[PDB]
Design a protein around this ligand. Structure first.
Ligand SMILES: Nc1ncc(-c2ccc(S(=O)(=O)N3CCOCC3)cc2)nc1C(=O)Nc1cccnc1
Length: 350
């Protein structure tokens, strides 16, 4: 193989297009947008990913907009973007150049699942905390990810750092304008979306995080619907039939045309016996029907499930130190600054 060179504007920086060179291209992903590659930067030999998408020449690309304005150690950094042409003869692709992170939460969880083992709760806390922190960041901008799932959580296995990726469904939600309801992967889809809501909040993402938490504890999806509609049934088999007032606050226009009566299944019986009670309790406040009842990502960060992460004696199981869990910015804390007293423990205050 050889060297490819392009002119790429830097991601969040100035609109100063520069020459970037890279080699060692290999496919690592795809979808409706196009293809994703791994590449090695010829300058630093740093691994990056390149998401290549077909851009309609005349409209703007909302993923690029969302990504140019994000800077967070639990999100994949847009290093550069650039344009290219080919395969479509006379048509243009937008190329996102992003941090490459080598593992995913789906693959870790799959690997313990195939071994009839459970991911140890220390990795559950580390992964879930970093997820919530990144949700607090994007939600402070009113950007909803709309695709929280284990496949979109990247991991460095040596540093235990997590990064959110795939902003292909991210939208900046304005109050007023509607949003499509058939969003998120089925398994992680919040119940108001299944009722066809169109003016939902960013709490759909928090729902999805609870699905991820619950899955990490169970070793399998908690709500495995076989269709977009039977998803709701799988939910009801755990949370019970939603009260009409709960259906009122998912979407007020009653597209509620289905289910029967099923008592809630006790939260303690749905998980395995040696499950931490703080885990269940955090789960129980994420997957609530009423969208305004779910914890915000910042409050879930403050949850007592993550007290071990606030201890001063905490090191990863491989002996190294935890990533930086407290370097909070004013933007992260904007939804509830007084949380800082819990989120930034004393042994880490300047
Ligand atoms: N920034 C990234 N950094 C790493 C990965 C990534 C990491 C590991 C794997 S992998 O474990 O399946 N294995 C690894 C090695 O070779 C075979 C595959 C696959 C992808 N993706 C992305 C990314 O942005 N993805 C994306 C974005 C938008 C839409 N759709 C996908």
């Amino acid at each position: 193989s050889k060297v490819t060179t392009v002119v790429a504007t830097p991601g969040q920086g100035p609109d100063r297009p520069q020459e970037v060179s890279y080699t060692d291209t290999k496919v690592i992903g795809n979808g409706s947008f196009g293809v994703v590659y791994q590449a090695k930067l010829c300058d630093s030999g740093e691994l990056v990913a390149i998401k290549k998408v077909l851009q309609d020449k005349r409209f703007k690309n909302r993923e690029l907009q969302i990504m140019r304005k994000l800077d967070h150690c639990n999100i994949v950094r847009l290093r550069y973007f650039f344009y290219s042409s080919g395969e479509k003869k006379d048509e243009v692709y937008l190329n996102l150049v992003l941090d490459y992170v080598p593992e995913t939460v789906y693959r870790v969880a799959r690997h313990y699942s195939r071994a009839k083992q459970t991911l140890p709760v220390i990795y559950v806390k580390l992964y879930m905390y970093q997820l919530f922190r990144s949700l607090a960041y994007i939600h402070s901008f009113g950007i909803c990810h709309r695709d929280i799932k284990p496949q979109n959580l990247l991991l460095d296995p040596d540093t235990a750092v997590l990064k959110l990726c795939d902003f292909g469904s991210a939208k900046q939600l304005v109050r007023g304008e509607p949003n499509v309801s058939y969003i998120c992967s089925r398994y992680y889809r919040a119940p108001e979306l299944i009722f066809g809501a169109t003016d939902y909040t960013s709490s759909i993402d928090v729902w999805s995080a609870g699905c991820v938490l619950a899955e990490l504890l169970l070793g399998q999806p908690i709500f495995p619907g076989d269709s977009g509609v039977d998803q709701l049934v799988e939910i009801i088999k755990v949370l019970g039939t939603p009260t009409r007032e709960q259906i009122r606050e998912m979407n007020p226009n009653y597209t509620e045309f289905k289910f029967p009566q099923i008592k809630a299944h006790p939260w303690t019986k749905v998980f395995r016996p040696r499950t931490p009670p703080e885990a269940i309790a955090l789960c129980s406040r994420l997957l609530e029907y009423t969208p305004t009842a779910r914890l915000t990502p910042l409050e879930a960060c403050a949850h007592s499930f993550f007290d071990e992460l606030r201890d001063p004696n905490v090191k990863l199981p491989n002996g190294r130190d935890t990533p930086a869990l407290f370097n909070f910015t004013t933007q992260e804390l904007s939804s509830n600054p007084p949380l800082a007293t819990i989120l930034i423990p004393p042994h880490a205050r300047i």
